[PDB]
Design a binder for this molecule. Structure first.
Ligand SMILES: Cc1cc(Oc2ccc(CC(=O)N3CCOC[C@H]3C(=O)O)cc2)ccc1C#N
Length: 188
């Protein structure tokens, strides 16, 4: 078959119920995640191949980067709460992996300030129980699939994308195979 378990995707032994339709996990410390955002735009290209209604969810993980890694999961909850993911994703990636200017929680906050989030707005959100609950959701979702590596994408809590089983001589062909695979899995 053209799409095969073990090839473009794998099937979770214990599938998780009530999971978001398309769920990505990343870390701002994760080198392939940097590529998936800045060079490949995986999330955008997947979204372009799915129906207009479908929901895509993207969550940060704690297991890379120690204390700053957990700060970043909380900051990502702030981003989701305020709806400013698109404004902060690139400068967070570059601050962690390119310019080495993100070394503390205050440095993370600077990125939001420079992106135009008001200081009181960020601090209030950072300390809010709405954001605490979003942190819990990010952790629960990774726990549900015993997540030990990123980037990762899961479809309907049942299938895990396997990019290592796709072709990578051509970056654009790779992205469309990935997106087309997500489409095939969503229609399963
Ligand atoms: C064109 C292109 C294709 C790519 O294909 C992939 C290759 C590998 C991965 C897996 C990954 O990152 N890991 C594996 C399990 O989780 C732990 C983590 C590790 O330990 O490294 C993901 C995608 C990557 C980058 C580019 C570019 N430019």
């Amino acid at each position: 078959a053209q799409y095969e378990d073990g090839k473009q995707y794998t099937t979770l032994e214990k599938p998780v119920a009530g999971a978001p339709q398309v769920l990505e996990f990343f870390s701002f410390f994760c080198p392939h995640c940097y590529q998936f955002e800045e060079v490949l735009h995986i999330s955008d290209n997947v979204k372009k191949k799915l129906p207009e209604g479908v929901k895509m969810t993207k969550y940060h993980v704690n297991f890379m980067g120690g204390d700053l890694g957990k700060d970043l999961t909380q900051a990502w909850a702030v981003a989701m709460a305020l709806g400013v993911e698109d404004k902060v994703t690139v400068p967070l990636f570059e601050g962690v992996q390119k310019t080495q200017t993100i070394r503390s929680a205050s440095d993370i906050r600077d990125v939001f300030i420079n992106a135009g989030i008001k200081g009181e707005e960020y601090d209030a959100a950072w300390n809010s129980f709405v954001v605490k609950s979003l942190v819990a959701q990010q952790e629960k979702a990774a726990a549900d699939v015993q997540l030990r590596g990123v980037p990762a994408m899961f479809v309907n809590g049942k299938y895990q994308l396997n990019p290592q089983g796709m072709d990578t001589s051509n970056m654009d062909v790779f992205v469309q195979q990935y997106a087309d695979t997500v489409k095939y899995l969503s229609e399963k």
